[PDB]
Design an enzyme around this catalytic site. Structure first.
Site, PDB file in Angstrom:
ATOM      1  CD1 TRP A  87      -2.918   1.241   0.278  1.00 14.38           C
ATOM      2  CD2 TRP A  87      -2.294   1.902   2.329  1.00 14.38           C
ATOM      3  NE1 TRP A  87      -3.771   2.237   0.677  1.00 14.38           N
ATOM      4  CE2 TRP A  87      -3.407   2.663   1.931  1.00 14.38           C
ATOM      5  CE3 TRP A  87      -1.721   2.143   3.583  1.00 14.38           C
ATOM      6  CZ2 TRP A  87      -3.968   3.640   2.742  1.00 14.38           C
ATOM      7  CZ3 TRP A  87      -2.271   3.121   4.385  1.00 14.38           C
ATOM      8  CH2 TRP A  87      -3.383   3.858   3.963  1.00 14.38           C
ATOM      9  CG  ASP A 102      -3.089  -2.635   6.446  1.00 14.42           C
ATOM     10  OD1 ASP A 102      -4.331  -2.654   6.571  1.00 14.42           O
ATOM     11  OD2 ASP A 102      -2.496  -1.763   5.771  1.00 14.42           O
ATOM     12  CE  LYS A 109      -9.676   0.272   1.146  1.00 21.90           C
ATOM     13  NZ  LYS A 109      -8.259  -0.071   1.550  1.00 21.90           N
TER      14      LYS A 109
END
Lengths: 400, 400
Positions: free
Chosen positions: B134, B215, B250
């Protein structure tokens, strides 16, 4: 094989704010009076959602079709309303396009973003705050590696703003320093500079070259929306650079939705753009983009004549209720035989004032009378109602 | 005189994404295809509000009676649901009270709170992330003064997880370091460790003594809610300490409400409570408390049988549409004469993959065909539909 990374961490000191709250909750006595809260309360002791806010939320429910990311600086309309409210319709600053605004998670978020921005991109190493000030200023600025120095402000014994002391202590503040001022309703003293004092301060900042940071969390709670921005606008009229950390937590009763802004001002558009690009970088490295709901509520209200009028009326009701409690407090103490003058309460504005009580009196007030104040003697006048005023005042008289 | 504090700020380099987006919006060609987007899109090219979310939002509108501040760690029920979702109901970690969760402004906020917490309270000086990872990972950890190092992960020529190189490169990571893993749907490669590889990684972490940071932003987008947490849980069973940064952006399509959490796990309840007291100070120094709206939406959905069933079916449809597009992409490439093996696309999880196209091919795709990818060649299969697949794939075959 290996020892833990967390094992040697030391327990933080207990949070006194939370401590006092826990204490109040455990107290089963019925006549309790809570002057220790940090929020507005109405005459029934609640903190309701504003009518203007319910209606804007209903509108959003009916009309939103996506939750996709806002840009780093948030909702543009929130940015524009913020700048208008702060600097005034048809401000040269706005006209000259000298201001950039990022919607942030509360004024707290705004202060942190300002701190990170300053630490990483400028030669600022020191931030001056008033003694006393809002409890979280020091921690926020220290977390970015900025030293925090205190300037003279409140004369506790006399319940006054000691302006000569303030001016003199700031002589130690250099070009390269930031100097933080509360826009209005100074927290926790309730005493603000007069206009003329604001002007003297603005002039001094230009002369010494330091960078003004205006923390404005109570616009509309002092004298009114436009009057409460007069100080900030004195600085804007004079200093070519400014940072403003604004909050809608209180003037919209949107505390938990985390609604505020950090506004940068520079000499010209090109310059503020360069600065603001680096502010965006600090945000990206923090929480990436700000939360939509609260700020969208505010934009919806301010952009709609009818809703704005409804909001202004509620806010006015809140400002006026607080002033009414100040007045009633002073009259009721006197009527109850207080061996002392409390008229300074009337000369102060916003929810907070220092009561002047000792930590021993505060303690006795809670233990004996179930009347709760902060150990500093800070009181939240919005915690007073016409119905609780008499017992409250009888308690205070009994501890003098 | 006194020069500007900002006068001399050097501008941040432009976000190339923004430039590319401008290009896209200005592109008047009717055939343009946008594979550069960073969010989910349905078959119509929209990112709608989930039905479960709208229903929860109506409930909040009708039932919320106040906006007063949440506690520093957020809504307690949001914390509990997060922990059950992560570790599974009746988890020994929960029973044993070894986990503490702070609601944060998005997974981004949780990462930043984690970095501040580590930098101020531990010996951690270095964080290891996958190559690639990311894009915001590095900025966040750097902002807290933590060094960021890369470990081997993606084999771009072959479109695989080079597990052997991963292991070997992690020999450099030391007992006092943090190593960050994507929970599932690796961003941007879409290739995740198998369960056996996860178990190996957990064993290694115990052997070397570094602290795993997980994460997890796409739980439910891979194979399913429970399956997607398998990796995390394999870590939970092995390593006595953990940090988890989770996101609802999301999987609830709540992007802009900024809903996420930072969860600490330690050897016993005493140690985690102690560590967590310091995490709270990190939040207090940042944005003070998290925004209520989105988190309260999530807590409302997960607490209600009916709402939960509606949300899970919506997430399932999302997961399955993404899978269909991956399968259709591979088959349509074959149809249009790719003759190059693109089956890796079927073996990957979530909306992102590296296409494997060069920056020259990316450029040609945009300029010649109006097919937009990011410079890295990252593509979002959710920008694909049964209707744009054919021309999209013909465009790709043509630049090969």
């Amino acid at each position: 094989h290996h020892v833990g990374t967390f094992e040697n961490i030391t327990a933080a000191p207990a949070d006194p704010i939370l401590g006092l709250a826990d204490l109040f909750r455990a107290d089963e006595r019925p006549g309790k009076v809570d002057l220790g809260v940090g929020v507005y309360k109405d005459e029934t002791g609640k903190t309701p959602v504003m009518t203007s806010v319910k209606k804007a939320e209903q509108y959003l429910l009916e009309n939103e079709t996506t939750k996709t990311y806002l840009g780093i600086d948030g909702i543009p309309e929130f940015g524009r309303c913020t700048q208008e409210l702060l600097f005034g319709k048809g401000s040269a600053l706005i006209n000259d396009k000298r201001a950039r605004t990022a919607q942030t998670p509360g004024g707290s978020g705004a202060l942190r973003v300002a701190a990170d921005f300053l630490a990483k991109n400028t030669s600022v190493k020191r931030v001056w705050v008033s003694n006393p000030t809002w409890p979280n200023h020091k921690a926020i600025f220290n977390s970015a590696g900025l030293e925090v120095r205190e300037y003279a402000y409140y004369d506790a014994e006399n319940h006054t703003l000691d302006f000569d002391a303030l001016i003199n202590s700031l002589n130690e503040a250099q070009a390269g320093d930031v100097v933080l001022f509360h826009g209005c309703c100074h927290n926790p003293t309730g005493i603000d500079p007069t206009l003329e004092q604001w002007q003297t301060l603005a002039q001094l900042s230009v002369e010494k070259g330091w960078l003004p940071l205006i923390d404005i969390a109570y616009q509309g709670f002092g004298r009114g929306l436009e009057e409460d921005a007069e100080g900030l606008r004195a600085f804007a009229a004079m200093h070519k650079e400014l940072i403003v950390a604004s909050s809608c937590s209180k003037n919209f009763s949107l505390y938990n939705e985390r609604v505020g802004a950090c506004t940068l001002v520079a000499a010209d558009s090109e310059t503020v753009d360069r600065a603001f690009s680096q502010m965006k970088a600090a945000i990206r490295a923090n929480y990436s983009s700000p939360p939509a709901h609260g700020a969208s509520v505010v934009a919806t209200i301010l952009s709609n004549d009818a809703l704005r009028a409804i909001w202004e009326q509620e806010l006015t009701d809140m400002r006026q209720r607080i002033q009414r409690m100040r007045q009633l407090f002073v009259n009721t103490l006197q009527e109850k035989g207080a061996n002392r003058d409390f008229s300074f309460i009337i000369k102060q504005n916003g929810m907070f004032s220092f009561s002047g009580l000792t930590k021993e009196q505060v303690l006795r007030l809670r233990e004996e009378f179930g009347v709760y104040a902060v150990a500093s003697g800070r009181i939240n006048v919005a915690g007073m109602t016409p119905d609780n005023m008499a017992p409250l005042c009888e308690a205070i008289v009994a501890v003098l």
